From a paper:
The second hitherto unknown bacterial proteasome family member was primarily found in Betaproteobacteria, hence its name BPH, short for Betaproteobacterial proteasome homologue. In this study, we present the first experimental characterization of two bacterial BPH proteins. Their crystal structures reveal homo-oligomeric double-barrel complexes with internalized active sites akin to those of proteasome and HslV. Unique structural features, however, like an elongated inner pore loop with a highly acidic sequence, distinguish BPH from its relatives. Confirming an initial hypothesis, our cluster analysis shows that BPH branches off from HslV and appears to be its direct descendant.
In crystallization trials, we obtained for Td-BPH a hexagonal crystal form diffracting to about 2.7 Å and an orthorhombic one diffracting to 2.3 Å. The higher-resolution orthorhombic crystal form could subsequently be solved in space group P212121 via molecular replacement, locating a single tetradecameric double ring in the ASU. The tetradecameric complexes from both crystal forms are virtually identical, and most of the sequence is resolved in all chains from Thr1 until Pro-190. However, in both crystal forms, the center portion of the pore loop (between Gln-95 and Glu-101) is disordered. In summary, both BPH proteins unequivocally form double rings with 7-fold symmetry in solution. Prominent residues in Td-BPH are Thr-1, Asp-17, and Lys-37, with Thr-1 acting as catalytic nucleophile. Lys-37 corresponds to Lys-33 in the proteasome; its function is to facilitate deprotonation of Thr-1 (28). Asp-17 assists in this reaction by orienting Lys-37 and making it prone to protonation. Equally present are e.g. conserved Gly-50, which helps to provide the oxyanion hole that stabilizes the transition state, and Ser-139, which forms hydrogen bonds with Thr-1. The S1 pocket, determining substrate specificity, is of hydrophobic character, priming it for the accommodation of uncharged amino acids.
Residue numbers in the entry:
A (entry chain A), B (entry chain G), C (entry chain F), D (entry chain E), E (entry chain B), G (entry chain I), ...: 1 to 95, 101 to 190
F (entry chain J): 1 to 95, 101 to 191
H (entry chain K): 1 to 95, 101 to 192
The structure:
Amino acid sequence: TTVTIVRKDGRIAIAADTLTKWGGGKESADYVANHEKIIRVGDSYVAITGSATFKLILADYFASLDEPPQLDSVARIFCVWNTLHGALKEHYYLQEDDLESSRMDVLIANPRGIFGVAAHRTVQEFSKFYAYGSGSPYALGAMYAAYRAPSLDAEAVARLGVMAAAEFHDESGLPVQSFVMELSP
Amino acid sequence: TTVTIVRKDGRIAIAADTLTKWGGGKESADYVANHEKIIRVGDSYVAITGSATFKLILADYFASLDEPPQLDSVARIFCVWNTLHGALKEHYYLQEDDLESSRMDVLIANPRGIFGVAAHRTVQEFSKFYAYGSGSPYALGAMYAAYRAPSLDAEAVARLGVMAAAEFHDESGLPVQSFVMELSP
Amino acid sequence: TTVTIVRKDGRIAIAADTLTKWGGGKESADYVANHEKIIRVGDSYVAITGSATFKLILADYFASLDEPPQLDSVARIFCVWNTLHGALKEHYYLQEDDLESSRMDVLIANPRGIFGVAAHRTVQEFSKFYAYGSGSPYALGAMYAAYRAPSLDAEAVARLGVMAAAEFHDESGLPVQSFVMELSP
Amino acid sequence: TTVTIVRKDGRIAIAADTLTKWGGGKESADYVANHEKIIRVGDSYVAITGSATFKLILADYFASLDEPPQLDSVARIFCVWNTLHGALKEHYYLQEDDLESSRMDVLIANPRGIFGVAAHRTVQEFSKFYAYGSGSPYALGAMYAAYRAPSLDAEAVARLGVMAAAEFHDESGLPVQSFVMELSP
Amino acid sequence: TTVTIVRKDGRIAIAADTLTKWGGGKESADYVANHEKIIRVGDSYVAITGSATFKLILADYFASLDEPPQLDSVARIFCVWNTLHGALKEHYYLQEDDLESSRMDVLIANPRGIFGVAAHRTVQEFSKFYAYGSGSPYALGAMYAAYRAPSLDAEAVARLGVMAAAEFHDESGLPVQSFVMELSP
Amino acid sequence: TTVTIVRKDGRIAIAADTLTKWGGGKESADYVANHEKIIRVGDSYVAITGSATFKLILADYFASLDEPPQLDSVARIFCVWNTLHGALKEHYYLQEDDLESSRMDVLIANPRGIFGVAAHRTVQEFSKFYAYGSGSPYALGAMYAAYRAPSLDAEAVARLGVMAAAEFHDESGLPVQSFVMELSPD
Amino acid sequence: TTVTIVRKDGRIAIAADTLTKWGGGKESADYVANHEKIIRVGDSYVAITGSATFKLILADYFASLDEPPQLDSVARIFCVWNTLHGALKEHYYLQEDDLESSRMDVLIANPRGIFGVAAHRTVQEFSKFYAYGSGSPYALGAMYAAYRAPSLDAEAVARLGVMAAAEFHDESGLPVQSFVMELSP
Amino acid sequence: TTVTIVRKDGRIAIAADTLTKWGGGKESADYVANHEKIIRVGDSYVAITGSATFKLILADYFASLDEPPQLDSVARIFCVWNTLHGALKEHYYLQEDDLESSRMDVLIANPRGIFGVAAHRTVQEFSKFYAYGSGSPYALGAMYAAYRAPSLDAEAVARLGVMAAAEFHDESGLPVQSFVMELSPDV
Amino acid sequence: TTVTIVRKDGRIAIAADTLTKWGGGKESADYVANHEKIIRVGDSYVAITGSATFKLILADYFASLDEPPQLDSVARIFCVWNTLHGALKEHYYLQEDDLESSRMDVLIANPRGIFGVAAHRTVQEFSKFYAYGSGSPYALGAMYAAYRAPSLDAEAVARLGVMAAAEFHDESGLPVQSFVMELSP
Amino acid sequence: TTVTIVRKDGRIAIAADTLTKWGGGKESADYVANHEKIIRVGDSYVAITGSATFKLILADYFASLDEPPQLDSVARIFCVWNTLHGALKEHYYLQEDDLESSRMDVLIANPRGIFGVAAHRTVQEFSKFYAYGSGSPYALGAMYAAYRAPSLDAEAVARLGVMAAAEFHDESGLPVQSFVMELSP
Amino acid sequence: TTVTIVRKDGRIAIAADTLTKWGGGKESADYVANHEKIIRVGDSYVAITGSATFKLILADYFASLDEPPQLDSVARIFCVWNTLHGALKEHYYLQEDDLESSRMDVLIANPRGIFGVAAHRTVQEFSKFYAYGSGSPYALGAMYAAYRAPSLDAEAVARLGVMAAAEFHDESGLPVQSFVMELSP
C-alpha cells in the first residue's frame, strides 16, 4: 500500500494505490470491484493502510456512531482514534511496544488541514505532504522532487507519489485513486 | 481444497473440488458420501475452504438464524461474517496478525454478484473470477487462460479452475461440484 | 488402536482391536477384563480411539442425558459432538489448530448408515468402509483389497482390517471385537 | 514405588513396597513409621503410587465424604475418580496430554474384583494381575513367571512382584506389605 | 529526542529538539506542524520524551482534570505521576523491572523549581541542569561545558544542550524549541 | 512413494508407484517421462524411496563400478550399502540417531531372494512380502489381505499393495510399475 | 520468477518472465538491461530461477568448460548438475534436507527434448509441459487449460504460462521472453 | 528388544526375542528371514540390542579381524569393545554423557562365563543372570522369580525372561531364540 | 547510505551522500575528512554502501591487484566481484541466503555504461537510473519524478536522488558528492 | 540450613544451625540477634528450613489462630499444613511438580512423637531421627553413626547432626540451638 | 557411589560401596562379579567414582605404562592425572567450566599418605579423612561423628562412612569393600 496526502496553493489532495495482496498474490483493481482504499467520513477523506479489512471496519464503525466525527484538529483526531482503538479490540477482534498498536496507518484530508494517524495513535498535522504504507519512502522522494513544480497542483503531486511506489514496490499497484478539495478559510 | 467463482456474460458460477484430507490421507467422494464443500444459504451458494468441519458449523449456524442473512453486498457480508466469527469462538471452539483469523476462506455466489471473504474478514466483490484454497493459484492460472474462450460459459471456466488444481495439487481431487445461475436485473 | 467400519450388501459392521497401551507397555484382553473399545449408545455402536478413558467418559456422559441421542445423520451427530466437546472440557478435564481438538476419533454404526467423527468434529458419512486410530492405514489397505471379494461380508471385511493393523502395528492387538447389523432401508 | 494386585483361587491380594524417596534420598520403613502405601477406603484397599503425599490426600478426602464410595465396578470407580480429580485441584493444590493427569496410578482391591486407575483416569478391571509405579515392569515380569505355580497363592504372587522390583530398582524397597481377602460369590 | 532544563541566575529554562522518528525515517518540524515536544500544564512547562503520542495523551489527560495539578514539589509530582500511570494503563492503552515503566522521561520547569520524572516515576529536583531522551549524554556534556559562561543565560545553555545532541545523534534534529521564566521568591 | 516386494510360489515380484512430489505439487507419469522408481542393477531390481534424485545417484554409482554388485545375500548387500553410504556423502552431497542415515529405503528383488535396506542400513531378507515409503502401511494391509489368495501371483499381490497406497495416500499415485521373475533353484 | 517449457506438435518452447526482486523492490526489464533469465548453453536453452546471480554464475561456469555440455538425457544432465553443484560451493560461494540444495530450479530446452533440474538435482524429462519458480502453480494451471487448444502452439502455451503468473504473483513481471526450436528426429 | 543371559547348574544359556521395529511398525520373524539377534563369535554368542544394523556391523567387523577375539574376561572384552568403538565411528558411521555411547548393549555367553557390555563400554561379569534391551526390567523380574525353580535349567530361565518382555512390551516379540552350553571346568 | 547512478542524454553520473553512522551517532563531512563514499577503480567510479570500512578495503584490494579491472560489462564485473569476495573473506575478515553475502551494495559508473553489484554478486547493467543503500527507496522515488525533466541533466538527477534520501532518512546526510562523464561511442 | 530431630530412650530432641544466607553472604548469630530457626507452637517446637522469612510467617500465622493447632498425628499435621499453604499464597505472597510446593521443609517435635513435613506436604512420623535443609545428608550421616552410642542422648545426637553440616556445608553455621522433652505416656 | 579414605593412628584405610547403577536400575554385588570400585596401582589403592567404565579404563591405562606411577605427592599425582586426561580423550572416548573435566573423582591411599583427585584434576592431600561420589555428604557426616571414637580404627571409620550413604542414598549399596595399611616412616 501507498497513501499520499498534499497541501499546496490553497488545495488539499489525497491519493491511494489500488492493489491488495494476499501473501505474494496480487489482487488488482482489475479483479476486485471494491478496490478503493480511501473512504469518506463526513467531509474528511480517510486513506487506510494495513489489512484490507480495515476500510470495512472503519466504514462500519464510523457509520455506527451517532454523528460522523470531527477530524479537523490534532486533539480531536487523537480523541476519536483512542476511542476507535477500544472498539477494534472489543468489537472487531484486533490483536514489545510503548503503546498498543491499532495496526493501521491512516492519512486524513479535509478542508481544515492534512493529517496522519500512525498505528500507535501518533496524530500529526502536515504542512506540505506525507505518505504511509510500505510504499511511503518512494512517494516521499517523488513528492519532494515535484512538490515545487509550478505545473503540478496538489492532486498531481499526490498521484505522482503513488505512481513512484507503484513503479518500484511489490505491494503497490495502478490505478491510482485520488481526491482533491479546496482549503477552508 | 480449491474453490473457484466466475462471472461472465450474464452468468454466475461457483465450483469446488470434493477431496477431504486427514493428514496425508485422502478422503475422496468415492469414500465420503457428504463430500460437498458448497452449501446453500438462502439464495446464495457458499464455497468453503479450511477444515471440513466448517461447512457443518456454517450450515448449523446459518440454519439457526431467524431469517437467512443478506450476502449480496460487501458491507452486508462483512457484518454477517464479523458476527459469525464471534459465534465461531464462543459456540464452535475456534482457536501475530493484525486481526483474529476465522480460519476459512469462502466464495459467495448469488444473482446479485460474486463475492469472497478471506480468513481475516477481508470482504471483496469480484468482477471476473477468483479462487481460494491451497489449489487457487492453479485455478487462477487456468481461468486466466480460459476466461475469454468463446466456447466456455461461466460454469465451464469455474469447473476448469478446480480441474487444474486437482491435476497438480495434493489437497484437491475430482469430481468437481459446480452451480450456475443468471445474473439478476 | 484400530477401529473399522464397513457397509456391504445391506449389512453394516464395525470392529476394533482389544489392546490398550501404557507407554510401551501392553495391556491386552488377556489381562484386562474391560478391553472393549466399542460401546452402545441408543441403537448405535460407537468405536472409540484415543485414550482408553474416553470409552468410560462417553458411556458416563451419554447415560447422564435425558435420553440417548440420534446418531443417524451428519447434521445430528455434529450437534451431539459439538455439545459433547463442551462437556469434555467442563466435566471431564479434557485439554495450534483451526478448531479445538476432542482428542478422539470415532466411528459410528447404526442401521441408518456408517459414520465417523474426527478429533476436530469433522463428521462424515462413509459409502463403503473407513477406519480410525494409529492402525487405520493398515486397515484401509486391507479393506480396499478385500471389500469386493464375494466370500467376505461386511463383518468379515471390518474384522480383516483390524487383523492387518494388529499384524504390523504396535498399538493394535488381537482379539478383534466386531458387531454386525442390518441396513435400515 | 511398586504396587501389585492379584486374583487367584478364590483369593484377591494387594501389595506395596514401603520405601519413600526424597530426591536420591531413601526413607525406609526403618526410619518412617507411616510407611504404608496402601490405605483402606470402605471395604476396599487402595494401593497408591506417585508423591508420598497422595496417601494422605486420599485418606483425608475420602474421610470427608458422607460415606465411603462404592469401588466395585469400572463405571463406579470412574465416577469417583473423576469427582476426586476436581477436589485435588480445588482443595489439595494439584498442578501435552489428552486429559489432565491426576498424577497417580492406583490399584484397588475388594471382594468384588481387582482394578486399577491410571493417572489419566483409565479405570480397568484385571483378570489375573497387574502392577503400577516405577517398579511395575519388574513386578509384571515376576508375576507372569509365578502366577501359574500351584504352590504360590494370590498373596505370594503379589508379594513376589514387589520383591522383584526392590531387587532391581532404586525407587522400591523392602519390607513388602500385603493384604488378602476372599472373592465374593 | 533530547530535552534539557536549566536553572541559572534567578532564571529557569526548558528546551527540546523538534525531530520525530518513524523507524529510520525522519519527520522534521519542516513537514510536521505539531512538532513541539513541550506542552503547558498550568504554569509548568513539561518536556516529554518517548513515543510522540505521549504529548497528546498528557495534554488530553491533564485537560480532563478538575484543576491543573500542582507540579512544584517532589512529593506532589510523584503523587500526580503515580495517578497518571493508572490512567495510561486504564484509558490510553499503555503496555523485567523493579516497577512498571511509564515509557517516558520528562522534565518539568515552573517558577518554583526545575524537576524531572524518569520512566519508573523517579522524581528528582535538579539544582543546575539536566537532560532526558536519547540525546541527553550529549546535552549534559555541552551544558556542563557552558553552564558557567557569564554571557550565556539559562535559555542559551538549555538550547545549546539540544543543539549538541542534534549535531551528533540521529534521533534529535533542529530547530530547538525553548522557554524561559523567572524564579519565584 | 510406495514400494512393494513379494515372494510367492517360486515367483518374485517388485512394484512401485509413479508419482513424484514437489511440496504439495504432484508430478504424475502423465507429465514426467522418467517416472520409474525401480532401476535395474545387474539381474537385481532395486525400488527406491526418498528423494527422486536417488535413482539418478544410484544408477550413476553402480554404473561407475568395475562390475554390478552382488545383491543376493544380507551380508553382501550390507557391504555394498556401507560403501555406497560413503559415496553418497563424498560424491553426491548427502547431508539423534544411532547411525547415520542414508536417507533412502530400498527393496531389492532378484532370482536369489527378496531384500530390503532401510535408511540406517538395516538389511533384511523377507520371506513373504514387505513395503517401504510413506505409503507402506496401506501396502502392508492390502498385501496381508491378499497374499494367500490363490488367484493372485507374486506380481498381482505386489501391485495391489501399491494400488492401496495410491488410493489413500497423497504421496503415491497410479500407474503402478512392476517386474516379476523366477526363483532360482537354491 | 516463472519459467515454463512446452513440447507440442514437433516443437519445443521455453519461456521466462524478466522481473528481478530486491526484497519487495521491483527491478523490471525497463530499468535492467540484462533482464533475461534464459541462457544459451551449447545448443540448449536454460531458464533459471532463484537468485538473479545464478544466471551469471552458470554463464561463467559453462563458458569456462572445454566443450559445451550435452544436456540431452536425464543421466547426462544429472552428471553435469552434480559436478556443477561442486563448483557452486567451491568457486561461487554457495551456502534439514535429504541432499544439499543447489538453490535454483532450471528448465532445459534442446532439440532432443524438454527437461528440468530441481534444486536437489532431481533431473526429469517432461512429456507435455512444466514450470518452475514461485510463479509455476499459475503457469501450470494456465498451460493445463490451454495446452490442447489448436490455436496455441508450443510457444503460445509457454508464454501464456508466464503471463498468468505475472498477472497474479509479485515475483513475476512482463515482458515475457521465449524461444522455440524444432524437435529432432 | 530383549536379550537374556543365565548361568545355572554348570550350564550357560543366552536368549533373545526376534522382533524388529520400524517406528511403531512391527517386523516379526514371520516376515523377516534374518530375525536372529544373536551371533557366534568364536565360541562366544553375542546378543545385541539397539538398531538391527548392529548385528550386521558386528559380524562384518569380527569376520574382518585376523583372528576371532577372546571374549572370556572383563579386561579382554573391554579392550575389544574399546577398539570396536573406534571402528564403529571410523568405518560404520556411528554418531551430554561421561563417555561416548556405542549405542548398543550386549550380552556375551561363552564356556568361561557370562558377561555384558553396556553402551558406554561398561563391561560386567554376571554371577546368575542379566538382561538388556527395552524389555530388561520385565525379563529381570521374571528371571528373579524363576531362577531358583528346580524344574528350570538355565535355558528355560533365559527364555522365560524373553517371554515376559514379549508379553508386556511393544518392542519385544515371539518367537524366542536361545543357545545353551556347558560351563567350562576351569571356572 | 544512499548511492545513485544516472544515464541520460549521452552523459553518465554517479552520486553519494557523505554521512557515516556509528550506531545512532552521526559522523558528518563537517567532522570527517575522508567522508567520500565514491572511489576510482580504473576509469570507473564505484559508490559503496554498507560498512564505512569497505571503501578502505577495496582501495587496498584493488591497489594491490595487477592491472586495474575492466568494469565495463556484466560478465567482467561479475568475474571481478566473485574474486573480490574470496579476498574479503581471506584477507579482510568478512563475516538463510542462497549465496554468501559480500555485505555491500555498489554502483559502477564508466563511459561504457552504468552498472550495479548487490551484496550477493548480482551484477546488473542499468538502462535509466538506480540507487542502493538504505536511502534508495527515497532516491528512486525522487529520480522517477525528475528523470524526464529537460532542465535536469544526469548529474542533477543523480544528486536530487541523494537529496531526497537525506531529507527523510537518518543514515544519509548532505553534502552530496557527485561525478559526471560522457557516454563513449 | 540444617534441622534435626531425634527420639531415643523416652526423650525427644530437635535442633538447628543459626546461619542465614544473603546470596554467598554469611549472616551469623554473632551479627543477627533473631537467629533462631526453631519456634514454639503450642507445646510443639517447629524447626524451619528454606527462606529465613518463613519462621516469621509461621509465627505470625499460628498466633492468629483461635487456639494452637494439634501437631501430634500425621492426619492432623497434614490438615494443618494443607490449610497453611492456602494462607501462604493468599496472605504471605508465596509463589513442574506433582503438587504445589510450600517451599519449606519442617520438623516437628512434641511429647507425642517426632514428625516432618516436606515442601510438598509429605507428612511423616519418624521412628529414630531425621534431618532437613541443605545440610541434611551430612546430619543423617553423623546421626546414623552416633545413634546407638549410650554416651549420647537424644539432644547430643540432634546437636551432632547440625554440627556435622556446619563442618562441611556452606549454608550451615554454629552455634546449634536445641530443645529436649519427655516422650509422653 | 561412595568412596572413603581415612588416616588415623598410623594406619591408612580406604573404602567403597559395591552397587552399580544403570539408570534407576540396581546391579548389586549379588548380581555382578566385578563389583569392586577400588583397584591396585603399584602399592596405591585407587577408589573410583563416575561411570562404572572408569575402573576398566584406569586399570587398562595403568597396566599399559612401563612402570606403575608414583602417587604419593600432590605434584606427582597431578602430573599423572594431567597426562591421564589426555589419554582419556585420545584412546577412551571421554567427553562450561574453568578446566575440562575428567568426569571422575578418586581417592588414593598408600603408605606415604591419603589423597584425592577431583574431576577437574584438583589434587589434594587429606589430613584426617574425606569422601567422594554422590554419597560423600552422608559419609563425611558419619566420619566426622566417628573419627575420634577410641574403639574405631581407620578402617572401621572408613567403612562406617560408606554404610551411612548406603543407608540413605539410592546410588550406594552394601557390601562395603575396604583395605587398610600402616603409615610408612
